[PDB]
Symmetry: D2
Subunit: 339 residues, 4 copies
């Protein structure tokens, strides 16, 4: 029933990666043929879905593992440049229905900053979406995290442009996959491993002072915050009453609740649970929660029929459904933006 909703964890893939798309679909889809069509389509099926389910505007991003799977830095950068130019062309068909996040190679802080800057300045992209750590090293088994001082130039570029960064999950690989996941492979993806990666990375940013050096940085997590709201009391307790007396305060000057009020956002992607939503409204606040789908790994129908029919007060339905994203992404006037 609500119109003009905003979704922003919505993936596409390049048509030339059909084999990679189908392998990934064998993990995370029960209808490979529809998945292939839907994840490559931009302007037809995706708009029909949005028109049926009251989604006015979507910010598109590249599927996982995406560029973060590419440990050759020259190929990785070329892939990201290609994706960004491709999606910028595709969204011109429906500029009042589609924005895009920058796709980035994250091997090098300045290289990523430049390409994000290009995407925002040349194309009006809305921010960056990155699938956790960048694969690096001779066989891809090394991981590049962004929660350190080398990445200050990148985070400062995010705050200068005043665009958010969405920390999306990706599958475990190499040594980590072999050691922890191969003997329980059905837990890979949404059931467990996705949250473990994103929460590690974002809390790393918390405790390594990224939001102290970059107080205006906005960071977005999908799936209602990858377990983090559940432990808000536990993390805050073990920060303020424990680790902050043992040295953590050297690199982390605010409480975990402060960072959720000032820096961190969560979305409803892949977590269509009113009971959890209500719990998240208490632990993080309706102001910091955004509607999102996780299409085409989730369907518009599951996400939107859930949200439209959830028992929820009118104030927060509007805020979560569009008005929070409207203020954060400086969005004026898209289809049904004030309906």
């Amino acid at each position: 029933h609500m119109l003009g909703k905003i979704a922003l964890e919505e993936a596409f893939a390049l048509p030339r990666f059909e084999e990679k798309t189908r392998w990934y679909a064998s993990l995370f889809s029960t209808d490979a043929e529809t998945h292939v069509k839907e994840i490559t389509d931009i302007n037809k099926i995706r708009i029909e879905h949005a028109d049926k389910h009251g989604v006015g505007y979507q910010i598109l991003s590249y599927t996982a593992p995406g560029v973060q799977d590419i440990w050759d830095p020259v190929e990785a950068q070329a892939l990201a440049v290609e994706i960004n130019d491709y999606i910028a062309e595709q969204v011109r068909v429906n500029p009042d229905r589609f924005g895009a996040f920058a796709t980035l190679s994250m091997h090098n802080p300045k290289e990523a900053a430049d390409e994000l800057r290009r995407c925002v300045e040349k194309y009006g992209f809305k921010g960056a979406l990155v699938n956790d750590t960048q694969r690096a090293g001779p066989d891809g088994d090394d991981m590049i995290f962004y929660d350190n001082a080398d990445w200050d130039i990148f985070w400062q570029t995010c705050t200068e442009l005043d665009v958010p960064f969405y920390m999306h999950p990706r599958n475990p690989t190499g040594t980590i996959y072999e050691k922890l996941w191969a003997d329980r492979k059905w837990l890979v993806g949404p059931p467990l491993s996705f949250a473990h990666g994103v929460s590690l990375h974002v809390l790393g940013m918390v405790t390594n002072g990224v939001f102290d050096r970059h107080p205006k940085l906005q960071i977005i997590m999908g799936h209602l915050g990858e377990h983090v709201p559940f432990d808000m009391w536990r993390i805050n307790h073990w920060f303020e009453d424990r680790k902050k007396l043992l040295g953590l305060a050297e690199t982390c000057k605010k409480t975990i609740r402060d960072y959720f009020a000032e820096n961190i956002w969560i979305t409803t992607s892949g977590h269509f649970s009113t009971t959890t939503l209500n719990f998240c409204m208490a632990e993080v606040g309706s102001d910091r929660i955004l509607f999102s789908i996780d299409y085409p790994f989730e369907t518009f129908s599951d996400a939107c029929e859930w949200f439209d029919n959830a028992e929820l007060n009118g104030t927060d339905r509007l805020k979560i459904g569009r008005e929070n994203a409207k203020k954060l992404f400086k969005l004026d006037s898209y289809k049904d933006s004030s309906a």
Copy 2:
């Protein structure tokens, strides 16, 4: 105000491990001297705490990382035998205030089964408490999980004796610690890494059919279930509507909600949050939630003043506070058990 409460995530250490105790305390205590006294004391300070805060009965267990830190299997087994004999002597001082969980070396399924059987039959121990995977391999960098068929003889010993198994966390080590945690070390322990380990292990048991082969097995998680209640909707969705159509149903015959109704328990250790407690009552049911403290890493005062004063209906305060544990551990008559 409530008397006769039961706590069961309550740690002790052997007096001869003072150096190891103090290093661990440097990570997780702000008062090393009191921690050393409290974690070694059984029958004086611990009883004074319990008497002040209405805790009638406690099931004691060995501190983490405990025997799971020992990758030499002969030393590991000897350490566990020693701990079990030691704690059995100590609790005879106050049999109406103290029980114990078996401490186990988990290098070998039958060896562990035998020692659990010895602990239960000879000493009346209440079950087993194990700190996640057993360290193994030449330098301790290998991990032994119990979610496979080799461990059927062990789980069958748990159901034959009809005693629960408590899956407690331990710190990351070796390769995992270096790769994921060293650059964000303040997240080790309660803030994050503990839950990531236990939830992986228990959901592994779920998806590898442990509770299908052993339908009566009772498994206990601390800290309100190590994030798992937060994702009950998400896990159930990605099981029943996704992975269960791609092959997961071969080794996992019930829903994740079924397993929480029939097999899995959570406790309130280290998570003194009424808001999270209420959310857990919805996602798992008051019947499956047990009071616990996590002493001496948490204080009786934080845990018991929280629980005693939490806004909660009388039915569930009794059940969570003692009556659930009373039925599960076949407990008759301890101090204030019906007060």
Copy 3:
């Protein structure tokens, strides 16, 4: 999807009162012709609905205002006897699908007690359902409440027979209607007046010590408890921290939370809200909540699609759906009672 559900706030009317039935339907139904057929039907339409929606057992009761609308005590008693004889015959047709509550004239405690006894001992009725106060006095402008010593013989009969009493609401009338409701008549019934009546009567029983003199008496409230769980904190505060120091303790020996743990039940009748149900789970506890519908004022479809599809842990779905009622009413097998 849940089978064997038990509903117990389900009304019927005698065929000969079609005129009263249509007048009541002009207030509370948007489909009067269907309402007339549904409220008089017992063994055909009602069964089909229950077969479609997983409802194995129903305890039937007489529509409001029912006998409580009759202020001639001789006429009232005769209608009560007439109704009980009628419904006892009707439920013989499908005894594994239906039980009944006694319908009573509440003009005289001993008279009400004897007719409840007859219903239980002659017909096997499961308790009583009464529509709030009994209209009395020359023009029906007086109200008979049952929260006083004259009614001890009646409450002692409920506890001797060990069967609950369901405090159902009825419309305001007479002076009360004219002074408070006539100028805001759309508030009459479910929107507000109903809960005001029942909550006053039941909290009267609390504060006049009915449950003190009859500690085994079980009292049931519909509609998730007629506002009372919302004010559980506030009522308990203004009792224990205020009125109990000024005189209330003289006739009220326990806390409001005790009485909800020991004497009071609530049902989901006409209140198909998971958010409010979760809150009631916190404030009264899943053990004290019973599924129910409020047919034909509510549909089977609304009530059952809500409950069957509500996000809820498996333990409490089974308890609220049937097992709480199976125990309170000592029910034998019925259709799908263990499905």
Copy 4:
């Protein structure tokens, strides 16, 4: 711990009414001597309490039953004028700590409108606080409600001046008291009668179209909204799916959720329950909830220790604590208003 809090359900009484003040205290206080001093004190004890507990600003209002108890309209109007003149002088002593609501005789819409206007325009009062219906008729047994067209000139004055109206409760009297409450007198006041009165009056305004004819009018309810959020689902169901098809739509153009999003506010006065506050956050939304105390019937300590220590996200603590009220009342700087 939160500084600069705003409370706005805070009562005072005129020194010359000590006899009425002590009689009311024999109903609602366990310490009459302190209550007498506290309810008459403005600038000493009240300030000390507020300094100890982080309350920067208070909007004062006249105790119940106040002017609404006076059925001589000439006497009523003169007491109203007397009270407003008195409190305006008292609050000059500490204008950065205190504001006031207008006290009104509600016998005549135009008379009430003019005295509200005088209070706002001469004294800078922030709105009106009225204790439910105005006692009227020869012996005060009639009630004047304000949910009708005769009161349009008054509601238009509230919207012209752009200041809210706080619907406070008062005791039942006369025929209503005798018929419903005299036999269960411990329910009078906070336990039940108060909410029944306010919720009836405010929902009357809804269903008689006051907010339709005055869409900018703001109405405030104490005590987390006098049961109404509990029945939000039930009221909305029986409006939109029932009464709105039978005639209600004629005088009621929007849903109950709309009116809570657009017109209605609730406060935490006398309802210091985090569990119930979370539920109200789901059903009405944190943007529509204001901190308040209900002093001196409640203590600063109860209200403020609850709110300052309640587990709550930082965004909503700031909004409920002060920022919601700072905006609704267009407040200038006050003590710690940005602390």
